[PDB]
Amino acid sequence: MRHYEIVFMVHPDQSEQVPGMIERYTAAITGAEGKIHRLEDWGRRQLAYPINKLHKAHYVLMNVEAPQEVIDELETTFRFNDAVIRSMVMRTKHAVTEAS
Amino acid sequence: RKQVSDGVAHIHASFNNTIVTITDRQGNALGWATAGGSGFRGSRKSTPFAAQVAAERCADAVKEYGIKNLEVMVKGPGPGRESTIRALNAAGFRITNITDVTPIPHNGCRPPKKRR
Amino acid sequence: IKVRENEPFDVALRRFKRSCEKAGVLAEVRRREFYEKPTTERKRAKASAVKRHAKKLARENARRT
Amino acid sequence: AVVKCKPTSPGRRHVVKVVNPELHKGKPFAPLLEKNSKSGGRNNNGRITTRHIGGGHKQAYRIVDFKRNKDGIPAVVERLEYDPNRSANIALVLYKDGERRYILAPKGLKAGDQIQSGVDAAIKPGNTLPMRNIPVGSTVHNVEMKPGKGGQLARSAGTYVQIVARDGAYVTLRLRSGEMRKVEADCRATLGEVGNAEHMLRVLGKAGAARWRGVRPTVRGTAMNPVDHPHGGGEGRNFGKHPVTPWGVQTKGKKTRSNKRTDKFIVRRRS
Amino acid sequence: FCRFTAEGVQEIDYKDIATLKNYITESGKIVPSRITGTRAKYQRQLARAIKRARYLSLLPYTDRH
Amino acid sequence: SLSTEATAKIVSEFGRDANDTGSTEVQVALLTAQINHLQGHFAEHKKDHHSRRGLLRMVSQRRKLLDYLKRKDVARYTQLIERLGLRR
RNA sequence: AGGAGGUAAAAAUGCCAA
RNA sequence: GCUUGAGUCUCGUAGAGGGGGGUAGAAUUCCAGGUGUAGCGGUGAAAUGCGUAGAGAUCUGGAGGAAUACCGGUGGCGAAGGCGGCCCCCUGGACGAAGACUGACGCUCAGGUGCGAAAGCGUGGGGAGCAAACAGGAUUAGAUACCCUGGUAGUCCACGCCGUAAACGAUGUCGACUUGGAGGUUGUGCCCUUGAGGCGUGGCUUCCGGAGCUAACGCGUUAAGUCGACCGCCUGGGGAGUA
């Protein structure tokens, strides 16, 4: 299909409840037969500028491949989730796993 | 009259005039002085010497608070940029650091077409 | 912007203003944009820099100084 | 869509009408109809209270739903129906158990679109939820003031309300007048804006087209006699009387807001 | 003279800011290519990686936050 | 896009073989596959005048080939347009 | 060799032909 | 018939090409307040204006619109007009290498049709900033101007219309041929990648300059050189691109 390089920051209070979210998204794509290749967790790291006056947040890295239907509903799950702040999706540019 | 150790000086050196203000660490304005109130009017108000004597009228009226060490914030090019800091390196104030907060935009809010 | 020169500096040492922009830049953004003169005043300034190069290796002029 | 007509006759010249192919072209759904006694603007004493009203053409009240109490029950839009009582258009909906009901139409609503209400519903125009599950900055319509009363705001044709901010136990709404108002955060609101946005573009065209809307000819005050209006009289269209109502109260800028019971909720006066 | 990954092949990445902080300045702006000596291909590719990394707050915009 | 999957069925359906990607009948079937395809693209936009010019080249490229084929090989010319449903 | 900042209050007209 | 002109297909590269939908920071203005005190603002100077009803300066918070610093460059792209934060979706066009195919399918173009900056016009939204008109202050012999303070249309968005510009490398389009040099940009091959390479081979672009040409200035392999094919137009200045 097409690869996508997803990052999304989440609210640092919901890092207590973060890994159950990641299994919903990874079963959304793998249930739609798209594969994942990375699952890199950057963790609770310090920001450089205060997004919503909030300091340090938690970062997730995906680097997955999926058909274009799965990402559009994925954006809405990132749109309506006040645990998640400032998500991002990029285009194919064929992917493999590295780069901590 | 409430004494304080650490203050902050805001220096606003606009082209026509420079207005200095010494505040606290939390933005509550302790006192201020300006180059229009320092006797000079117009042309003489546009002078680095008028800027240096403006902070000397702000060197007092902060003596009720007794600030020893202070930060310095500058904004605006003016003539008053590298003059009022020399109005405090003689006036006995431990300058911790000097920063600059000149409001550079990122290309918004179109400027005027000023004088031809 | 930010300078400390940490403990015994005793004097301004403020190279940092012309080191990046902050004197020269807002005496440019402060007025008329023209939308066109930015193409025009880049034309001659780039024309001058090639004329600056035109006399660099053409320094083989004698004049008997 | 919005069409213009060709000047075959004077009165057919300036007429512009909206026409809509997806409107149901038959009888309305019979058991959701009552009658409605047209009054002519008179009340139980029998005097004219609101002037310039009366006549036109018979109508039939369609009981629309406003409360949207069916929760956890998906439903299916049957067809978009014309409604002469509203200014919007309505939709006959079929709930999954079998009930048929009338709701206002969101603008992005085709026949066959599946909606749901309650609290479990998703953000999709046609759904109703209590406004703390609705994310801040959304566009809702048909929102009620009291928690469960009905819906009174943004229910005319092509109107909407932007949710400004959720202030804990309350929520701030900017109405269509340009007025920011607090409502209780546990009120229902239907997502998306009302359809029939081209109602604004409609021009009647002839005097009789106003008549069958039920209105009557407004006589302007300066033609009446001085016993009949505060203006009026003279010898050739005089004036000079600081324009008022027919009961001698200043119009053209004179505020009549005197409530004192809802100033708890009005954040900013409209402008 | 002192160029970069043109023979050291890269696909310049916006996540590893350790190489990205070399080509920003101390004030938080993107350095010109004419001083760093990078090629025009691998300097447009990196300024894209800066504005990406500015969006994730890995690098500031200037300081005023 | 008219993908490598999409075109490979068209060159097999019309060519002398799969290596015959150059014929007049192959190119016209490539154009009408794409001219019909962008009719969905040029409905919602209707104001993208830039990429519309690339369609008008694909139209005019098709028109010049049919006038060549009609001048050349009339039996296949009246074979193609009823295999495609075009020409007015 | 490279580079930065600063630098004018208004001020009109003079016949026709040689 | 044929392949060298045109065209297709395969693998890829580069890009402010276009349309649509999101999204982010800096800044201005505004709104509510905290601290705080007499000016601020502007200018050649001043005044109008603003401010003790508490401004301006400063701090926190909120709203709103518009534009995208740095990168950024006689850099890239597009037929031209034009196009600049970032992300997605739909989508045009160019280019490169080694092969394959069709077989002159080509060039140009009156009328015709399409696109076409800015300003205008229409409807419905939007309105921070900026600013025709307009008002006030100065200036001046006068100043219905520059300058100052304001400030509506307008600029913004969606959809129609207008169809003009110093719409300009003031240079129609296509092809072939004829010394060089220094760069920019984007491919690609080979060689020792052995290090910012070495030698080529393509596309595009900037400057200089020879023969030649030109009234001269200057153009000068991207011609204004040497020719070929079509098209547009000119015939003293005004009157007039007007009736």
Curated annotation (Swiss-Prot), chain A:
Processing after translation: 5 different forms of the protein, varying only in the number of C-terminal glutamate residues, were isolated. The sequence shown is form bS6-6, which is the longest. The first two Glu are encoded by the rpsF gene, the other Glu are added post-translationally by the RimK enzyme.
Keyword terms, alphabetized: Acetylation, Ribonucleoprotein, Ribosomal protein, RNA-binding, rRNA-binding
Positions of post-translational N6-acetyllysine modification: 93
GO molecular function: mRNA 5'-UTR binding; small ribosomal subunit rRNA binding; structural constituent of ribosome
GO biological process, one term: cytoplasmic translation
Gene Ontology cellular component terms for the protein in this record: cytoplasm; cytosol; cytosolic small ribosomal subunit
Protein's job: Binds together with bS18 to 16S ribosomal RNA.
Quaternary structure and interacting proteins, as annotated: Part of the 30S ribosomal subunit. Interacts weakly with uL2 in one of the 3.5 A resolved structures.
Family, similarity comment: Belongs to the bacterial ribosomal protein bS6 family.
Protein name in the entry: Small ribosomal subunit protein bS6
Residue window of the full protein shown: 1 to 100 of 135
From Swiss-Prot, chain D:
UniProt key word Acetylation: yes
Biased composition (Low complexity): 38-47
Effect of residue 229 to Q: Loss of peptidyltransferase activity in reconstituted ribosomes. No change in rRNA binding or assembly into ribosomes
Span list, region Disordered: 27-52, 220-271
GO terms of molecular function: RNA binding; rRNA binding; structural constituent of ribosome; transferase activity; zinc ion binding
InterPro entries: NA-bd_OB-fold, Rib_uL2_dom2, Ribosomal_uL2, Ribosomal_uL2_bac/org-type, Ribosomal_uL2_C, Ribosomal_uL2_CS, Ribosomal_uL2_dom3, Ribosomal_uL2_RNA-bd_dom
Keyword terms of this UniProt record: Acetylation, Ribonucleoprotein, Ribosomal protein, RNA-binding, rRNA-binding
Gene3D superfamilies: 2.30.30.30, Nucleic acid-binding proteins, Ribosomal protein L2, domain 3
NCBIfam families reported for this sequence: rplB_bact (TIGR01171)
Subunit (UniProt): Part of the 50S ribosomal subunit. Forms a bridge to the 30S subunit in the 70S ribosome, contacting the 16S rRNA. Interacts weakly with S6 in one of the 3.5 A resolved structures. In pull-down experiments interacts with CedA.
Protein name (database record): Large ribosomal subunit protein uL2
Species of the source: Escherichia coli (strain K12)
Lineage of source species: Bacteria, Pseudomonadati, Pseudomonadota, Gammaproteobacteria, Enterobacterales
UniProtKB/Swiss-Prot annotation, chain E:
Family membership: Belongs to the bacterial ribosomal protein bS18 family.
Taxon lineage: Bacteria, Pseudomonadati, Pseudomonadota, Gammaproteobacteria, Enterobacterales
A Pfam match: Ribosomal_S18
Swiss-Prot/TrEMBL keywords: Acetylation, Ribonucleoprotein, Ribosomal protein, RNA-binding, rRNA-binding
Function comment: Binds as a heterodimer with protein bS6 to the central domain of the 16S rRNA, where it helps stabilize the platform of the 30S subunit.
InterPro entries from the UniProt entry: Ribosomal_bS18, Ribosomal_bS18_CS, Ribosomal_bS18_sf
Domain of life: Bacteria
Cellular component annotations (GO), alphabetically ordered: cytoplasm; cytosol; cytosolic small ribosomal subunit
MF term (GO), any: mRNA 5'-UTR binding
UniProt name for this protein: Small ribosomal subunit protein bS18
Disulfides per UniProt: none
Subunit composition and interactions: Part of the 30S ribosomal subunit. Forms a tight heterodimer with protein bS6.
Gene expressing this chain: rpsR
GO BP terms: cytoplasmic translation; translation
SUPFAM superfamilies: Ribosomal protein S18 (SSF46911)
From Swiss-Prot, chain F:
One Pfam family cited in the UniProt record for this chain: Ribosomal_S15
Subunit (UniProt): Part of the 30S ribosomal subunit. Forms a bridge to the 50S subunit in the 70S ribosome, contacting the 23S rRNA.
Inducing factors: Part of the metY operon that extends to pnp, also has its own promoter.
NCBIfam families: S15_bact
Designated gene of the protein: rpsO
Protein name: Small ribosomal subunit protein uS15
Job description of the protein: One of the primary rRNA binding proteins, it binds directly to 16S rRNA where it helps nucleate assembly of the platform of the 30S subunit by binding and bridging several RNA helices of the 16S rRNA. Binds to its own mRNA, stabilizing it 5-UTR and preventing its translation. In the E.coli 70S ribosome it has been modeled to contact the 23S rRNA of the 50S subunit forming part of bridge B4. In the two 3.5 A resolved ribosome structures there are minor differences between side-chain conformations.
Alphabetical UniProt keywords: Ribonucleoprotein, Ribosomal protein, RNA-binding, rRNA-binding, Translation regulation
